[PDB]
Design a protein around this ligand. Structure first.
Ligand SMILES: [Zn+2]
Ligand SMILES: [Zn+2]
Ligand SMILES: [Zn+2]
Ligand SMILES: [Zn+2]
Ligand SMILES: [Zn+2]
Ligand SMILES: [Zn+2]
Lengths: 65, 65, 67, 64, 67, 67
DNA sequence: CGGCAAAAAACGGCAAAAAA
DNA sequence: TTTTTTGCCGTTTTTTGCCG
């Protein structure tokens, strides 16, 4: 979890808000949160890839929340 | 103990002090601290972005306290 | 949103169908191959030779034809 | 030793005696300053404005 | 599957048969050598010197000699 | 093996015998010195000035001569 | 307008691992 | 070792949207 992360990701997932995930290496990924558990986030754009949280630096929701 | 990270972040949150969050890759993220939990800091500039703590090196206030 | 409820079904789905995957590491290195098996911290990637890949060095796991 | 033992007294001795330190991060950035407080995960740096340093970014802590 | 059900039998298999291995770090450095021993966090890479490699710095462990 | 069977006896042996070691970090910088002491997360390394080295920044601990 | 069911998020018990 | 803490999972209770 939890507390501030999970409701944030859930709110972003429900409203299909486009997001810009920034990895620690600098690479930006775009798409929508399809699912997420404690360690990974299922990012969906034209393919549906699994992204490890430990590699993620920031999750930037493209439209105000 | 986790007892120096909380009172710090809450102090910053309460005083609405503009901070500079450095990432491990050298990126500087200026803005306000909306809320936080064990592993994420919510950071508020033109958009509320979620920042993973594990990607953060230093959190530098522009003010004291 | 529960611990490990998504990663395991995802990887198991990728392996059981032997779907070709591209595993991007945190350093940029792309590892093309097929998930042969996985556990809590590692993923055994099989292409030419079965190499063990640590998950903490993994950024993304991208399937090449949908799962 | 075994279990969170050497780290705490090292930082404590650095804090009590107000000893100036240079903190080398995993990227290469050198942060000189003074240790005001510390806990399991973070370290106050004092210097000009108390700045919070995450240990997971810290490579080493060298006394002066 | 789960836990270390895979990374332990793998490293063990690399250690009993004493196959030469190739340990890529997350920084790009390649470490050829041979698994002498390992525990939860470290791996003993024997060569001219036995060096202790931390798992959190390891990205891929490839069997050369493979098979 | 499991646990810290192998990482504690190694560092302890390197400390008892005051063996000079080269500690490589994940960024490539090569520290050198002598294990004064160590615990779960850090290693106290003593050379011209004693310093505290976080294990999470360490890739390998390479002795000069055997264990 | 009132139950019905999906889902979240808070509560609590369990048991491995840290601390003493 | 003993004792304690804490992250780990399973449950309940509340919400919310659909359906009756
Ligand atoms: Zn995290
Ligand atoms: Zn941290
Ligand atoms: Zn690991
Ligand atoms: Zn991970
Ligand atoms: Zn640490
Ligand atoms: Zn470690």
């Amino acid at each position: 979890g939890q507390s501030l992360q999970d409701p944030f990701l859930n709110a972003l997932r429900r409203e299909r808000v486009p997001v810009s995930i920034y990895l620690v290496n600098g690479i930006k990924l775009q798409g929508q949160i399809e699912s997420f558990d404690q360690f990974v986030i299922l990012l969906k754009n034209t393919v549906s890839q699994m992204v490890y949280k430990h590699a993620i630096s920031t999750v930037v929701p493209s439209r105000p929340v």
